[PDB]
Amino acid sequence: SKEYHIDEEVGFALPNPQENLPDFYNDWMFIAKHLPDLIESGQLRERVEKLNMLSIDHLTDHKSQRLARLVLGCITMAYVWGKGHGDVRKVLPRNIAVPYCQLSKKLELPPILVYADCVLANWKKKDPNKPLTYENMDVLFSFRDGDCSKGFFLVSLLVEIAAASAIKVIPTVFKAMQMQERDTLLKALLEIASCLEKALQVFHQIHDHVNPKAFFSVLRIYLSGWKGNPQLSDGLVYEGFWEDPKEFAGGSAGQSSVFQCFDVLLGIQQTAGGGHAAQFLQDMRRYMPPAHRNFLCSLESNPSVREFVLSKGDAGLREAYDACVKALVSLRSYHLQIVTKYILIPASQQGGTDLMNFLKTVRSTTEKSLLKEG
Numbered sequence: 501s502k503e504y505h506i507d508e509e510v511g512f513a514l515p516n517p518q519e520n521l522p523d524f525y526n527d528w529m530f531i532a533k534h535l536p537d538l539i540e541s542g543q544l545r546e547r548v549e550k551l552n553m554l555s556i557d558h559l560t561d562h563k564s565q566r567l568a569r570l571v572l573g574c575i576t577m578a579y580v581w582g583k584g585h586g587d588v589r590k591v592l593p594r595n596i597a598v599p600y601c602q603l604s605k606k607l608e609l610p611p612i613l614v615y616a617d618c619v620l621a622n623w624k625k626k627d628p629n630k631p632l633t634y635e636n637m638d639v640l641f642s643f644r645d646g647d648c649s650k651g652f653f654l655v656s657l658l659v660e661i662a663a664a665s666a667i668k669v670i671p672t673v674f675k676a677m678q679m680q681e682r683d684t685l686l687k688a689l690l691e692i693a694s695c696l697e698k699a700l701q702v703f704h705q706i707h708d709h710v711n712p713k714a715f716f717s718v719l720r721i722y723l724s725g726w727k728g729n730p731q732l733s734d735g736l737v738y739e740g741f742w743e744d745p746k747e748f749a750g751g752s753a754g755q756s757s758v759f760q761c762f763d764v765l766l767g768i769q770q771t772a773g774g775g776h777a778a779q780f781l782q783d784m785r786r787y788m789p790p791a792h793r794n795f796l797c798s799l800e801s802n803p804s805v806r807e808f809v810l811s812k813g814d815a816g817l818r819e820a821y822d823a824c825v826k827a828l829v830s831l832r833s834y835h836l837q838i839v840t841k842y843i844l845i846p847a848s849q850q851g852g853t854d855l856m857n858f859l860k861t862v863r864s865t866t867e868k869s870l871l872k873e874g
């Protein structure tokens with residue numbers, strides 16, 4: 501793979517994200533690195549409002565621009581939602597909104613915190629010579645003490661990383677159809693299936709590191725956006741950059757490329773059909789790093805893996821293909837059980853129906869791609 505910013509070890513995750521910005525930006529970093537303290541003491545907003553305007557010119561390399569997106573995105577979430585009890589701000593001040601927006605357009609991303617900010621670039625190893633294991637990793641930024649952001653972000657990232665070993669096989673699949681190399685393709689499909697079955701075990705770590713109460717009542721709040729949100733009905737005013745309010749959705753794993761790229765690979769047309777679910781997933785591509793968007797665009801322009809398998813009358817190939825679809829169905833089914841525990845039941849003490857019907861649509865579409873099954 502080329503300049504699609506895909507890493508052979510960590511996949512769509514940003515490799516070795518840097519922890520520190522230039523000294524020109526310490527006033528940003530001191531805020532972001534102390535969000536728990538400043539929100540609780542009610543000092544955050546005042547200190548945001550006391551900021552001067554830094555130019556984004558001293559952010560020269562891609563890594564530091566990503567880190568700055570993660571810093572200004574967390575600060576914005578904290579500024580907008582405050583202590584997370586519903587007393588919101590509807591105006592982002594000039595002095596953070598301008599640099600945040602100039603940086604976001606520079607990177608072809610919206611000026612709101614997205615998946616690629618707070619998962620893909622929000623991590624580090626404690627010990628660089630150890631393995632990419634939960635025990636040896638940590639997030640860069642959290643919102644509140646006890647918000648379980650570390651567990652939530654890291655377990656997502658560890659799933660993202662487990663998918664990386666299946667991504668590096670994609671080149672093999674397309675090369676094999678182009679060369680009409682059936683046995684080579686069959687093995688490639690089985691290797692992808694195996695990797696997706698291994699990513700299921702990674703999901704099991706969510707239970708040991710995320711608490712439903714804290715997740716539902718705290719973390720969810722700081723991850724909300726201002727699209728179709730009754731609390732900022734017309735959106736957020738990015739003061740000094742746009743005279744008008746604007747709506748952007750909060751962080752959503754529909755912005756993640758790991759599952760979409762396998763949907764594309766397997767010919768699971770998740771974005772066809774006119775439903776709300778297809779609409780949502782297509783909309784969320786604008787919240788992906790443009791290089792990953794372009795990678796997904798490259799997958800779609802390739803010949804259909806599915807139609808190739810269906811056209812060969814080859815039971816071995818159809819079973820290898822179905823192994824991949826079954827593995828995807830298995831992930832989304834377990835994931836649905838997660839949502840039941842972490843959203844549905846906390847909501848009822850001790851809305852979600854729309855969210856789960858979305859996931860259920862995505863799952864059933866996946867399940868309908870199975871072959872000689874029906």
Ligand code: HEM
Nearest residue numbers: 655656659660752753754756759832838839842843855862
């Ligand atoms: C407490 C744990 C979790 C909860 C409550 C949860 C909840 C949700 C919800 C409500 C959605 C639909 C809205 C959206 O797009 O974000 C969703 C989608 C999604 N989530 Fe999660 N999630 C959790 C953990 C994870 C983890 C660890 C991953 C690993 C990457 C993940 C991957 C995805 C993906 C790929 C989607 C897009 C839908 C699909 O492809 O089927 N989720 N999740």
Ligand SMILES: O[C@H](C[C@H]1c2ccccc2-c2cncn21)C1CCCCC1
Nearest residue numbers: 615618619653656720723751752753843
């Ligand atoms: O699903 C998204 C959150 C999202 C997210 C944000 C940041 C990092 C990871 C993830 C994630 C993983 N699965 C869903 N999401 C919201 C949807 C509203 C309920 C609380 C979760």
